[PDB]
Design a protein around this ligand. Structure first.
Ligand SMILES: Nc1nc2c(c(=O)[nH]1)N[C@H]1C(S)=C(S)[C@@H](COP(=O)(O)OP(=O)(O)OC[C@H]3O[C@@H](n4cnc5c(=O)[nH]c(N)nc54)[C@H](O)[C@@H]3O)O[C@H]1N2
Ligand SMILES: Nc1nc2c(c(=O)[nH]1)N[C@H]1C(S)=C(S)[C@@H](COP(=O)(O)OP(=O)(O)OC[C@H]3O[C@@H](n4cnc5c(=O)[nH]c(N)nc54)[C@H](O)[C@@H]3O)O[C@H]1N2
Ligand code: HEM
Ligand code: F3S
Ligand code: FES
Ligand code: FES
Ligand SMILES: [Mo+4]
Ligand SMILES: [O]
Lengths: 132, 843, 102, 132
């Protein structure tokens, strides 16, 4: 198989999400931590009827410290070496030591409203293949 | 040898998105499909999981549709997402039958990819010369500067002060949308006189000769190459230069594969396998391929002296006429019967620079053209028995007294060859005399260069002959130069002198702009115009890469090419296809037609602000938001049969599209024209073809005989099969640059040994016009005294040693070039890895 | 069996045509074959080693033919059909069952 | 799983090779026709004591036409569309319609002189994976 085979995993329903509060989640398996986040404005990789639901790896691509979320700035913040990632701009490193922007999830909302993740746009921290 | 080390490609899934793609490159216009799918999806090896419905876990055999090479695969942006893309030859296209050339098969890997790092040279942003170098800026800023300098200079000195160089061709860097957009700006909104085309330094036809005679140069179909008794190929290297027309249509004829179709379509006459005459001073891989598929018996390579085609053709015409090997009924019904008086200056000169040849009846032309077999033998250096046999292969009837069917094909050996107007005429005489126009197995055609995609307002204002634009520029005339999709630095004639002066004149404007405040735009504009007034030139380049002439330009605007946009063009068969957009423009690049519309909109605003609302109003009609708007304003409203053609209808007809001109629309099918002049009514006021009283007069371009007489070597020039044009994409393609990091100059091994030269050596070719460099490539098949240098090549420009010499209609006589060769240095170490073996396939 | 001789003929079809219309290509048309002479077909340019092995007098009987599709090269040294030649002898037998039609 | 996993296959012995005579071989399976070839000169990718033994796929990378060897020029020649490959220079297309130089074998000569193929440097004609 030339490409990584990504499972199509249910993570949540649109109705489970509050504006600007991350929901803890994991993809493509239970040992790769991440969040779903409703930002309240239309954005890159943003699904749902407002185009504002995004999903990201929450493990820092530098050395794997878990990232905190700043509700005020809508940024992910690494207490490891002070890296900052912008979930409103496809996870662009605003500032930091990672050589990657924050790995982001290919999300699909179903007719029923369930949210499936079907891929990741960068290598997740601590695995040499996104699917192990 | 360059190896990709790609062991494995993604499988195209069953549900991949399909896009009809015509080849970006040569006239043949081979059909392809672009299959795109999400970056995180892939196809399976089982039939239900890939696009082919085939089990891919099993080896596929020769000519498989269920395979693609690495060069056919990339990752590209589509609607702002990365997708897999495969760009594959269409097995069901009648043109190529799933063949792809060395060029078209790398459309995918010569695409722009951030993810796979392909063609990072591609322009993403407007660049302006300020603060002492090129600097990226906004469209609004760049267009405002271009318009303010353009509007001021034409307001102050007239439109004659605006110089334009632009593509007039089809496919990528051309096409109906882009010729219309540039044509409307410079010929509708304005009356630009001082405009040249991508391959010639005035606004002229390559082939006024055939056209004045009433024979449009693309009058047949590709099937006729399958159906001819004889093919006459003149100054074409079709295997390298029109590859899949040769392979998919000529080869079947020469091999007899065609015999069944011949008998079905023309019973009531005899048919043997096709024979071929090749008029070319050089033995090509085309001569070899023909010998090897039809045997030496069936191939007549007429190795004429450089630029003597007209002598050969006048002798064939004379011999054929004298034998009555002519279609008497065709001549009497479909050609001009009225006698007309020779011009006073004949035969040395035409009635004017405008009309270098005399149009007449069959009988007047024969007596005018009249040349003995003995004399043509003297001039051509052919043997009498070669010319007589060539006459028999064209003229002599088949068994039941039936007409021999001859497709006459020519390209740049004739067109860039001696006495363009007369040679073109002398060849049409032969096809006219033998009724080989508008019949199956016939035609007298260009074999072509780019695809065709021309639709523009009238060019009546330009004149005939038109302005020799390069001489205006070298002579210090013009203020502003707009350059669209051409690179004179690599491809014009007299290129050394062109560069000397172009650099000095653009340098004067550069120094002024480096010394003036940019953030105050009006002062920047005034410093530019003051520098122009001292003899400077402001240059704007519209391209997809940083060009060589772009190193002299003050503004670069980034264009989107075919595939990043919808594009319509037709092949050397008039086969019109829609290339359907499959990917995004790189960065902020925009289609040429939409750049023209945007510059038009900016011209309107700047002219309104300067307080000239009347001139400003001429720049209306440019509200296009997509390339389709340009198609509908241009081709749809102005092309012959345009009202029948839309994107939607063209899409439905796929890579086979339809032959122009379109005659109607019936249940999801545009109806087209398989052949021109089937009713024997030609493109003239009264409907009669004219013959051409086209006497031989030597090498007609100024200084050519002198250049032959005063230099040791012929520097013949033209294409390599591997290289596409000026290597604008190829120069960032390891596969091509691994093969030829330097342009080859084909030299006779005995000539190299006499000059102390070995394979790979770097040599200076020099003469009266300038100097350039190439890598010596030992070529046993090359005649002594006669070299061939790859043209248009960034790492050694052949144009530097071509003179300013043109015919009366300003056609560049590139092929008749002579110079001396001396060593620069021993084979550079980067040539050590090169193969120096024959390009000729061995059985 | 001739059904799985059609599958083995995929390795010939590039150079060889068979059935209604079949014309000469890189290789000569292969219609009939069983009962045709060597260097047989009109139009095709056979090698000075395939002409030399018609001079002595031959036919395409099924034993002469098995030796060819297995090692064309040194079996008829100087033949223009350079190509490994089918190594499984039961496939040599399948493709000749296909050749039995036409 | 990230790269193609190449079998280490026995092809021949150094003793089985006659100067300038291609030995017909299959690698990396039965259906991937190629040759071994001694060239009597030291060249790119060459193995054995003289460094003159090369291995190439012998199916045209253009349209799958079986190639043929010319002993005089030491070139593979395609009768399909007249491609020429130079196995003295790493199988460079000397002229041709392939977008690839001739796929070449990674050869190892063991102590007994048995020759092994461990990989291929280009995509073999008619398979989207060099190992099927
Ligand atoms: N000595 C000699 N000189 C010759 C010839 C010869 O036989 N001998 N041949 C002549 C002939 S036939 C020709 S065609 C000319 C070719 O002369 P040029 O037209 O100068 O050569 P190309 O390489 O085709 O140039 C195409 C340019 O357009 C750019 N381009 C490509 N696509 C696009 C697009 O979509 N938009 C824009 N805006 N730009 C684009 C490319 O990056 C490149 O700079 O050379 C001529 N010069
Ligand atoms: N691979 C490849 N194919 C291309 C192109 C490319 O860049 N690369 N470009 C395309 C374009 S824009 C064009 S215009 C065409 C050009 O296609 P061609 O015109 O077929 O190609 P050239 O190599 O320019 O010249 C053709 C032949 O003219 C011969 N010749 C030189 N002097 C004379 C003469 O006095 N008389 C005669 N009869 N022949 C002479 C040369 O030896 C050469 O073999 O190729 C098109 N296709
Ligand atoms: C299973 C596959 C093939 C079969 C069964 C086959 C069969 C044959 C046969 C029976 C002949 C001799 C017939 C005669 O003399 O008229 C022949 C000759 C020939 N074949 Fe094939 N062939 C096959 C594949 C190929 C391939 C792949 C090529 C070329 C790449 C090819 C090229 C030729 C040539 C050139 C000759 C003429 C030999 C000469 O002139 O010396 N064949 N083939
Ligand atoms: S693939 Fe492209 S380059 Fe010419 S021969 Fe066919 S159009
Ligand atoms: S681990 Fe996050 S900044 Fe280093
Ligand atoms: S298959 Fe070899 S050149 Fe086309
Ligand atoms: Mo051209
Ligand atoms: O051209």
């Amino acid at each position: 198989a030339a490409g990584v085979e990504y499972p199509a995993n249910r993570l949540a329903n649109i109705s489970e999400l509050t504006l600007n509060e991350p929901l803890d989640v994991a993809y493509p398996d239970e040992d790769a931590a991440g969040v779903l986040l409703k930002l309240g404005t239309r954005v890159e990789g943003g699904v749902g009827p407002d185009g504002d639901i995004v999903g990201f790896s929450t493990i820092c691509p530098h050395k794997g410290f878990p990232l905190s979320y700043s509700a005020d700035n809508k940024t992910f913040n690494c207490p490891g070496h002070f890296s900052v990632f912008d979930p409103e701009k496809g996870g662009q490193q605003v500032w930091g030591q990672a050589t990657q922007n924050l790995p982001q999830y290919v999300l699909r909302v179903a007719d029923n409203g369930d949210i499936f993740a079907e891929g990741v746009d960068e290598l997740i921290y601590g695995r040499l293949s996104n699917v192990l | 040898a360059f190896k990709r080390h790609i062991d494995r490609l993604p499988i195209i899934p069953a549900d991949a998105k399909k896009h009809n793609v015509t080849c970006h490159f040569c006239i043949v216009g081979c059909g392809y499909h672009a299959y795109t799918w999400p970056i995180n999806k892939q196809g399976g090896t089982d039939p239900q999981n890939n696009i082919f419905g085939v089990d891919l876990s099993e080896q596929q055999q020769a000519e498989s549709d269920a395979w693609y090479s690495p060069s056919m695969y990339n990752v590209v942006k589509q609607d702002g997402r990365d997708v897999h893309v495969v760009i594959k030859p269409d097995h069901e296209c009648v043109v190529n039958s799933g063949l792809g050339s060395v060029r078209g098969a790398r459309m995918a890997e010569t695409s722009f990819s951030e993810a796979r790092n392909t063609q990072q040279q591609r322009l993403t942003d407007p660049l302006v010369w300020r603060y002492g170098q090129m600097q990226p800026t906004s469209w609004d800023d760049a267009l405002d500067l271009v318009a303010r300098v353009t509007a001021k200079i034409v307001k102050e000195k007239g439109e004659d002060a605006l110089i334009v160089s632009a593509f007039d061709h089809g496919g990528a860097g051309g096409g109906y949308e882009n010729t219309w957009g540039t044509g409307k700006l410079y010929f509708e909104a304005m009356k630009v006189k001082n405009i040249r085309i991508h391959n010639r330094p005035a606004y002229n036809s390559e082939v006024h000769g055939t056209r004045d005679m009433g024979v449009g140069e693309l009058n047949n179909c590709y099937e006729d190459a399958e159906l001819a008794d004889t093919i006459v190929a003149v100054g074409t290297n079709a295997l390298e230069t029109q590859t899949n027309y040769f392979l998919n249509h000529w080869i079947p004829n020469l091999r007899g594969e065609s015999l069944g179709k011949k008998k079905e379509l023309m019973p009531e006459e005899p048919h043997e396998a096709g024979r071929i005459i090749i008029v070319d001073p050089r033995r090509t891989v085309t001569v070899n391929a023909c010998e090897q598929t039809a045997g030496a018996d069936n191939v007549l390579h007429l190795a004429i002296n450089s630029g003597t085609d007209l002598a050969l053709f006048n002798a064939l015409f004379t011999y054929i006429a004298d034998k009555g090997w002519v279609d008497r009924d065709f001549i009497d019904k479909s050609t001009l019967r009225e006698g007309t008086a020779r011009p006073p200056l004949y035969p040395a000169r035409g009635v004017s620079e405008a009309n270098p040849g005399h149009l007449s009846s069959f009988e007047d032309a024969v007596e005018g053209c009249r040349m003995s077999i003995e004399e043509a033998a003297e001039i051509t250096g052919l043997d009498a028995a070669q010319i007589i046999k060539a006459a028999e292969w064209i003229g002599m009837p088949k068994e039941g007294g039936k007409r021999r069917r001859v497709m006459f094909g020519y390209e740049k050996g004739l067109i860039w060859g001696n006495d363009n107007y007369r040679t073109n005429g002398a060849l049409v005489n032969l096809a006219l005399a033998t009724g080989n126009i508008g019949r199956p197995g016939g035609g007298v055609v260009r074999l072509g260069g780019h695809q065709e995609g021309y639709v523009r307002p009238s060019d009546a204002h330009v004149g005939r002959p038109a302005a020799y634009v390069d001489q205006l520029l070298i002579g210090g005339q013009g203020g502003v130069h707009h350059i669209w999709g051409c690179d004179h630095y690599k491809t014009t004639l007299n290129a050394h002198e062109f560069k000397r002066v172009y650099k000095k004149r653009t340098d004067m404007v550069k120094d002024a702009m480096s010394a003036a405040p940019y953030g105050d735009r009006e002062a920047m504009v005034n410093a530019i115009v003051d520098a122009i007034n001292q003899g400077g030139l402001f240059a704007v380049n519209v391209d997809i890469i940083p060009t060589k002439i772009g190193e002299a330009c003050h503004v670069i605007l980034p264009a989107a090419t075919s595939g990043e946009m919808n594009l319509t063009s037709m092949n050397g068969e008039r086969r019109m296809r829609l290339t359907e957009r499959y990917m995004d423009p790189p960065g902020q690049s925009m289609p040429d037609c939409l750049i023209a519309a945007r510059l038009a909109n900016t011209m309107e605003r700047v002219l309104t602000e300067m307080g000239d609302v009347g001139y400003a109003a001429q720049f209306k009609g440019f509200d296009w938001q997509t390339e389709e708007d340009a198609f509908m304003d241009g081709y749809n409203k102005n092309a012959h049969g345009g009202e029948f053609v839309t994107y939607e209808r063209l899409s439905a007809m796929g890579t086979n599209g339809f032959q122009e001109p379109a005659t109607g629309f019936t249940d999801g099918k545009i109806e087209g024209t398989q052949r021109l002049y089937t009713d024997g009514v030609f493109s003239t006021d009264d409907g009669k073809a004219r013959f051409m009283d086209a006497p031989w007069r030597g090498l007609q371009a100024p200084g050519k005989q002198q250049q032959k007489d005063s230099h040791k070597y012929l520097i013949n020039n033209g294409r390599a099969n591997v290289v596409w044009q000026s290597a604008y994409l190829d120069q960032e393609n390891d596969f091509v640059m691994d093969r030829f990091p330097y342009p080859f100059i084909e030299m006779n091994p005995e000539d190299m040994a006499e000059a102390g030269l070995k394979e790979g050596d770097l040599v200076e070719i020099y003469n009266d016009a300038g100097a350039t460099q190439a890598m010596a490539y030992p070529t046993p098949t090359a005649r002594r005294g006669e070299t061939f240098m790859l043209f248009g090549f960034p790492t050694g420009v052949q144009g530097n040693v071509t003179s300013a010499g043109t015919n009366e209609l300003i056609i560049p006589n590139y092929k008749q070039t002579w110079g001396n060769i001396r060593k620069i240095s021993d084979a550079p170490r980067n040539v050590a890895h090169l193969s120096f073996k024959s390009k000729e396939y061995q059985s | 069996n001739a059904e799985k001789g059609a599958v083995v003929f995929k390795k010939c079809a590039a150079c060889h045509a068979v059935g209604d219309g079949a014309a000469n290509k890189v290789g000569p048309e292969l219609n009939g074959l069983i009962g045709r002479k060597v260097a047989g077909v009109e139009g095709f340019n056979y090698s000075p080693a395939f002409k030399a092995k018609a001079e002595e007098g031959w036919v395409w009987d099924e034993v002469h033919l098995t030796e060819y599709l297995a090692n064309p090269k040194a079996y008829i040294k100087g033949t223009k059909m350079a190509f490994a030649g089918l190594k499984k002898p039961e496939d040599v037998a399948d493709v000749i069952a296909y050749l039995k039609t036409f």
